[PDB]
Amino acid sequence: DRVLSLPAVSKNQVLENVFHTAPKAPVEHLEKMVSANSKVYDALNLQSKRVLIWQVKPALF
Amino acid sequence: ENDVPAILKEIDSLVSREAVSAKEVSDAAVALTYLQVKANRRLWGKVLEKAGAAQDYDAASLTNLLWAINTGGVEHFKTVAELAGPAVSLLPSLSPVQLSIVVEALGGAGVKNYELYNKASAVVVSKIGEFKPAEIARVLYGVAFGGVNDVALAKAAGKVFASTEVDSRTAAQALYALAKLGRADKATVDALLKSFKKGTESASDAAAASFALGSLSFKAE
């Protein structure tokens, strides 16, 4: 019964309790806000090719 | 050093920026009538785009704008009829020469604002000696073409047109206002037909008194 003197908690159960959640990448906040601000650039810039300014406040010709 | 199309491009860049105030949009419109810019419609459209966006309005810039809209012959009902919001808010603040310009401009554009012409006739029938007879015909042209059949003003206007002899341009505006109201009071029309003997500098008021007589069927004078 030498196995009953070993620590009963496995090496697996350490690695699943220590690394419980996959950690958040540092660049995940950049490349998710950049792709969402590329839609703020597109719609709202006045130099974008797809601006909303001509379909929101139309024109007066 | 005398550049008209290079000063249109500097007015175009004044009203194409982001925060044009009331005074800058008013004076850009005044500069476009004195320069007689009927050919460029987009530049007149950029001014009336910022004329609806402008939120400040004092008594001076509203009347310089509305003079320039009426004199320049530029028509946009949505922009002009929302300039009656500043006008009813600035209505005690207006000079009697300034109140004649806003009602002649909002009336001549067809703005259906019964709260404006009721209060703007009440300052003419209360302070009638304060108003020059050219300023009574401007209010009378406004309240008539704004859809108000205000004969309390049309009587008080006729008391002035028989007491003071008026200009030919003043009388023909007063005839055009009475022709739309359809009044044909010969005690007032004949007081305005004696103003057309010193000659008329404009054809547009000789043509308008021509229309206003035949609409009431008086005769050619």
Automatic annotation (TrEMBL), chain A:
It comes from the Eukaryota. This is Mitochondrial F1F0 ATP synthase associated 14 kDa protein. It comes from Polytomella sp. Pringsheim 198.80.
